Ligand binder design. Structure first.
Ligand code: NA
Length: 92
DNA sequence: AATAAGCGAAGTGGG
DNA sequence: TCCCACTTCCGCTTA
């Protein structure tokens, strides 16, 4: 099964949900979710995973928090809904 | 208050 | 056995 960071990177590369997520500085790997349209993207994540319950942005962000300990994805301080892929994730 | 967002122990998958 | 990679639940804090 695809991992959450790869799901998000693939969305950013494809442009398929441009109203829900976008690059802020692609060279740095920084991206941001839409306040108003993030739930649609969270829903897609849960459907792609085949999870039992409906996925919410809150649950998806709880998973993202675990990446922050390992550095896979860092949450940008002093910003909302903004994150940054590690250099390793971006190299493929 | 209402709403949004940040923060951070037990249950489920698939090894 | 016991870790992976989240998922779900619960609830407090900050804006
Ligand atoms: Na526990």
């Amino acid at each position: 099964k695809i991992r959450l960071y790869q799901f998000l990177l693939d969305l950013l590369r494809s442009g398929d949900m441009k109203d829900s997520i976008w690059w802020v500085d692609k060279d740095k790997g920084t991206f941001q979710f839409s306040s108003k349209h993030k739930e649609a993207l969270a829903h897609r994540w849960g459907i792609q995973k085949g999870n039992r319950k409906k996925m919410t942005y809150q649950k998806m962000a709880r998973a993202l928090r675990n990446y922050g300990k390992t550095g896979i994805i860092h949450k940008t301080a002093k910003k909302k809904l903004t994150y940054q892929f590690s250099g390793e994730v971006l190299g493929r």
